[PDB]
């Protein structure tokens, strides 16, 4: 087996086609299924896997009310082949209330963070063994991407933050070789707050679109140079911004450089990617709630500040249904690298108070150069049919 280089051009896409759906919550009403949140997808050279952070319990289980507590020690990273729901035979890969995973072409790396809020531990597990660990540097919830990391030529990179979720924090970019941290670079550039980066290979480097939880409803961009470990950062140019909450399209702004200070506090994990001057992106349909999901291309969305001309819109989840986190993953084809994404479909609390638990299912779409129609692929569980 050879290391992945991702040294193929990006696939020229026309939109996205349906790829996978796990129906987790529907199944939870008639079977033993893990309570989860913060899912993601990552593929080895042959096939894709779904990941999520378990809550140390199944849904039809009195322990499912534990989701009211943050970052419990029982949270573990779950890993299954994509489309296999999180049943009781699911492997718990590590202890984690925040994680990132990626395959370097030879083996899996898992970054798993657990322990006390003020003194967390990140474990680095490669090829089935613990290779390294790092402690909290700002004593305030050491945390990572909640989506796939990216490896080029045997060096994997992952973005981590420690510090305030509502003010200046300490973001660092780690470079990892076979599980061993070989370099750490501080965040540099004009991004002022970085959470939950959605990263993708853009040979020879890595590009991340993240969540500003402090002053921006425009999404920050982090650019990682894999040759010399240098970091740059800015904000997505698009005037159609990607965060939730955000302003209406008619009053939203981005200048590519600074947080827009428009309903900037809080946010949701999301993604976008460049194609020349243009931008492909997803976001919730609701401006203030994690409801619905849509994708579109913004003409000049990458290069032109405040660009608002969209095309190729697709509804993924209609606005009568709950969404959640979303993130990118990349899949190597015969001649190009394709971009795909997943959407977390959150059910239960806080939005649905009949039940005491919070959990999710997922839906997954992949880039296509072909054609497609329309639809909506929500979680689909009837809240009234669920164990409370």
């Amino acid at each position: 087996v050879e290391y992945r280089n991702w040294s193929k051009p990006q696939c020229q896409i026309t939109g996205f086609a349906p790829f996978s759906k796990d129906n987790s919550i529907r199944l939870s009403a008639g079977g033993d299924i893990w309570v989860t949140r913060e899912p993601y997808v990552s593929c080895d050279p042959g096939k894709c896997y779904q990941f999520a952070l378990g809550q140390g319990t199944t849904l039809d289980n009195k322990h499912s009310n534990d989701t009211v507590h943050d970052r419990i020690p029982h949270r573990t990273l779950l890993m299954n082949e994509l489309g296999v729901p999180f049943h009781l035979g699911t492997r718990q890969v590590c202890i984690a209330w925040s994680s990132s995973s990626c395959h370097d072409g030879k083996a899996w790396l898992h970054v798993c963070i657990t322990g006390d809020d003020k003194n967390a531990t990140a474990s680095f597990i490669y090829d089935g063994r613990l290779v390294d660990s790092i402690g909290s540097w700002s004593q305030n919830i050491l945390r990572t991407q909640e989506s796939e990391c990216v490896c080029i030529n045997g060096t994997c990179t992952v973005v981590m933050t420690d510090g305030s979720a509502s003010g200046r924090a300490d973001t660092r970019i780690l470079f990892i070789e076979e599980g061993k941290i070989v370099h750490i670079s501080p965040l540099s550039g004009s991004a002022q707050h970085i959470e939950e980066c959605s990263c993708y290979p853009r040979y020879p480097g890595v590009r991340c679109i993240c969540r500003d939880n402090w002053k921006g409803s425009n999404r920050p961009v982090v650019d990682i140079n894999m040759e010399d470990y240098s970091i740059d950062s800015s904000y997505v140019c698009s005037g159609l911004v990607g965060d939730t909450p955000r302003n209406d399209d008619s009053s939203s702004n981005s200048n590519c450089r600074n947080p827009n200070n428009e309903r900037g506090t809080q946010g949701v994990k999301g993604w976008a990617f460049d194609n020349g001057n243009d931008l492909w992106m997803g976001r919730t349909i609701s401006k203030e709630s994690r409801s619905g999901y849509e994708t579109f291309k913004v003409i000049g969305g990458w290069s032109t500040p405040n660009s608002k001309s969209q095309v190729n819109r697709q509804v993924i989840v209609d606005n009568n249904n709950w969404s959640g986190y979303s993130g990118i993953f990349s899949v190597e084809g015969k001649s190009c690298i394709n971009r795909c994404f997943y959407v977390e479909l959150i059910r239960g609390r806080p939005q649905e108070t009949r039940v005491w638990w919070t959990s999710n299912s997922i839906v997954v779409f992949c880039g296509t150069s072909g054609t497609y129609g329309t639809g909506s692929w929500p979680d689909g569980a009837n809240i009234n049919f669920m164990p409370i």
Copy 2:
């Protein structure tokens, strides 16, 4: 691994021997089992797999009443080794309310259709990644085989239809190489309505026996030329016709060219294959309902219009028990290509109204050159024991 060519003669069979049964509905009364319909079987060069369209729920689950709705976004293609029932560890391969799958000798292709009735999307997934997609061309339930596609020398073919289920529609034959659509041929010849083709390799080409849902109780034939992409079509010659509904044996007709206009509207997915001038075929025992299943050879059933002399009858499911869809699959042996078939055994609605759900189990038989006896292998569940 090399591409399949299927370039061996067809096995000379005397009838069929029992191969597999999954007992899905019986198990559903005492375990967590997926609600399904439209099952089929396809084998890689080593082993066979069972497929079905899930309804995003298990049977003992309040969501099982969702089967009243057509083409829900929660339908996914399920895939297990043949004989492994659809338990909660089953992989959902893609999002699909219509599908076809096949292995080209190197990897699996799945064709998965989902989305809105008037604007559906077909996704083409090969070797675990999305390679292509196509949108609806007639804005009226883009749909496909519900059984295995066929690949010769790395080119897979699949039959798709879009348009009316009760009048002239737009049927197209797709040619797919490693998941990429390389050519699309319109239907040609005298078949006037094509649904749910059961296709098989007949080197150097592919032959399909389908369902005419409009004017014929005789089954259409589609012949696919894999060398130049040309298409021909007609009707099975046999005066013993394969569709349900149909006339009784004394008043049924086929002229090999046109739909017979005998109880022609509606139908059921089924299969047949040629052996020289003769025809092996299956059908429901009832002429009006999806009850029972029988196979036999029709002497001159391929070459002689209105041929009605049968031999080698076998009851697969007696007429006191429900059947459903049936389809062909092909299995390469040491020196010949064998033909096998599955029968869908539908339980629940509309025939059994004690329950709200509709689901199925399967029974599977394979061609034999040896000898065999008699029996009946129905679903076997007691409807009174079932969750409603």
Copy 3:
């Protein structure tokens, strides 16, 4: 991969050591577990598998009362790694109410019999495909070993019977190459009734110890010549006889040649094997009921008519607990071929009438050249804790 020849001497054993137990019935009280009977064990070159005939249902399931009926069409052969209980992810290998399985060094052969009592079908499945089939020759419950078949140099042999279970029947020995029947030899010699043979490789031939259901409580022996397909048969010499029912040890007899006519009618599947003049054998502890299980060596038990000197007795299941069928399997070691056995532990009807079902668990022991102690390894379920 090379064909198995079993061309090593037999291991020189001192008794048997515990190998495996599946706890099926205990687990059935708190989990979804298949209803089974007629289990056996067979190993590929690397590891062992447990097999059993399912009843198309789990135990905690209203369909579990179906065991009152004989040879239902829903019975299927189940196959799992040894020690994996028959959970819902278990593969159903074929449709069977009687079976035999074996690995030839390259691939698995399964012999699966199903269908009508008076007109059954035996299917022969090799390397995951149906290769051959044979119909009933005496129109009276075509049936086979219910334990492993044996292959030498790519030819597998299996013993089958058709006809009366309480009078002269028609026993035949089949020789199978890659799933294809290449020769059938009629039973020859002095054995007068043959059921459920427990066979083992004894290079260059195969030896079987079987069940006489007609006139013998001494067990018949069938010797199979793999070179020229010739058959010989007789009875185990030991005056300590292996069948149940049987006479007390003080009044039991065998002359090595004829059925003893001592409580000869009926029986139970069992095993024995030769080592020079001596015999290793198992049997129920009770003379008239399938209760308890014991093994011992009979000095001169192979060569001396009516020999009754035993040594090296071991209790496997004490006589306060139910047993059932038992059979041999052989395992290739570094320098010798070891003999192992399994015991079926039947729970439920007819002995335990609180419940309506009949099912079993298994315990497995293997030959040892070492030392060992004592114990008892019964099913262990409390009948009062079971679903009825």
Copy 4:
């Protein structure tokens, strides 16, 4: 595949990082999970496995009250990939109420003890077959490590004891090649009572830290010479002693040679390892009960009698939560051999009498040369939510 030699230096660790947690008891309240105790971890050259002794039942099952009885014949060794909870698809590897397992680089060896207290049998299973067995030598609960054995150059060693648990016993060290016992050495040196050794490779030999159940709260050490089979034994030097019960830190003693006669009777399985003059060790936080778990390095803890200066303490389980057995396992890295440990988290009887059963979950930590924070990772189940 080549034999493991473990001929790399020990990794220089700063403490331990979180590796795995299975949440078994929490899951048992909403799923079918095995009742277990005496768990351990062992890895093949690629990945880690969790083992435990089943009680022949799931937790939500009336048979769960069987844990009141000692050493039932239904106890079997369970084996899953690390992090896969013991669901119903778990393989029971052998019959065992005491066990040890290890991989020699080519295949797994399992040592499985079962049968009567006064006459037990140890079975030795290698590469999926029974190779050897030994009977009880002292007729008083033949028993072994309950953690991984160690193999160097194809010879595996395991420590076994037979005789009194509260007085002088007969401890022997076995040397096993491909499942065959090749040599047995009696215990030699100054250790006066040996139970449940936690052993690790210390090339060219093996070192074990055990449990003195008779006169010592200091842990015995067994040194095994793999070249000439010679045995040495002593006690851990550290004045901070590892057993439970024990004296408080101000009044505990060890002289490296003799049991300390300080609350010496009874004990708990535990571990330690040397690094030069220093000692890494774990123990319960409570001095009297199996509550809490802590690790630390003792300066001069290996070489200096009664050394009590500790550094690098970590809480693994806080003292408000139940612990249990703990043991070491070793994992080969690129250039060093790492040490890891597991902690058994016992729930139910005798400490929690709302339920009748006793079971456990696990938490697992691995040596790190990096940095880390703090936390506590207890079982996490709410005893009031459990089936009784």
